[PDB]
Amino acid sequence: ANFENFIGATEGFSEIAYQFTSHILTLGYAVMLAGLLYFILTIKNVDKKFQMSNILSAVVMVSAFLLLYAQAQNWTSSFTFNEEVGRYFLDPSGDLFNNGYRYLNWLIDVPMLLFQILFVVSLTTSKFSSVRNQFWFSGAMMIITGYIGQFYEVSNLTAFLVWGAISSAFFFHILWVMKKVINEGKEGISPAGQKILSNIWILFLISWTLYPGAYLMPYLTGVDGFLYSEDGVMARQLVYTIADVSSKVIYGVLLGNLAITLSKN
Numbered sequence: 001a002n003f004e005n006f007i008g009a010t011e012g013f014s015e016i017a018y019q020f021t022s023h024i025l026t027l028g029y030a031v032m033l034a035g036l037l038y039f040i041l042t043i044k045n046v047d048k049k050f051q052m053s054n055i056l057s058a059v060v061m062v063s064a065f066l067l068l069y070a071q072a073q074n075w076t077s078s079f080t081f082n083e084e085v086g087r088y089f090l091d092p093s094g095d096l097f098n099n100g101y102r103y104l105n106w107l108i109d110v111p112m113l114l115f116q117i118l119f120v121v122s123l124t125t126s127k128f129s130s131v132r133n134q135f136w137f138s139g140a141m142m143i144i145t146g147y148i149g150q151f152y153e154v155s156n157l158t159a160f161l162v163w164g165a166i167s168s169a170f171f172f173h174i175l176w177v178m179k180k181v182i183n184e185g186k187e188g189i190s191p192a193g194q195k196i197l198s199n200i201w202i203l204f205l206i207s208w209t210l211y212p213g214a215y216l217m218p219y220l221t222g223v224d225g226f227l228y229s230e231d232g233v234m235a236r237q238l239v240y241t242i243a244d245v246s247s248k249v250i251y252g253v254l255l256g257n258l259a260i261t262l263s264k265n
């Protein structure tokens with residue numbers, strides 16, 4: 001199937017690759033539940049006019065909590081310890097590790113995260129429905145072609161890369177539209193608000209680039225290097241979790257800070 005199962009069937013997992021990776025994925029859904037509460041309780045602090053951004057954050061938190069909970073559980077129960085050999089191995093009496101929970105969660109989140117900035121900032125010369133449509137279309141293709149090529153991770157590498165590139169194309173379109181949004185949204189807001197918009201742009205830039213980095217990570221040091229081990233598994237799932245916290249939680253915190261700042265009139 002995927003590179004995690006491959007390693008879990010050929011080599012196996014040490015006790016600290018398995019446990020660390022169970023612990024990092026558990027932290028990841030724990031944060032989403034703490035986010036959920038943060039976004040509900042804070043709705044009171046922003047004018048009715050920006051509150052839709054909180055609403056959307058809350059819904060993203062709900063979706064990610066549940067699906068990343070499934071992903072966590074799909075990791076713990078996929079491997080079992082062989083006390084003879086001392087490593088954790090893929091369990092044939094199991095469901096086998098599956099990235100589908102995470103990809104599904106991106107597909108749901110991607111329109112809400114992109115749409116929500118458009119309730120905090122104003123466009124100038126661009127049309128609202130035009131930005132929305134471009135966002136929703138290319139965000140969905142990006143995740144789907146990201147998902148297709150992920151089935152060929154271990155089997156066919158050339159496909160894994162060509163599909164991953166097809167998914168980069170859509171990714172970069174999104175970065176174009178977002179940069180445009182952020183420029184127009186800077187016009188006629190305060191210097192404080194403009195500061196926060198610039199922070200949002202950099203956080204959105206780093207955090208979303210982590211994801212194709214995590215896609216490639218097992219092959220980053222070549223088809224026989226350091227990362228082509230259970231360490232690319234640890235690194236891949238550490239990067240995904242950082243990217244989930246940054247693109248979903250931190251992003252919407254910054255947007256809520258931008259909204260409050262915009263109630264200074």
Ligand SMILES: *C\C=C(C)/C=C/C=C(C)/C=C/C1=C(C)CCCC1(C)C
Nearest residue numbers: 106109110146167168171211212215
């Ligand atoms: C959790 C919320 C969101 C919006 C997740 C976004 C994920 C990405 C931007 C993933 C992008 C990919 C790219 C650019 C190319 C390889 C395949 C990926 C799906 C990992």
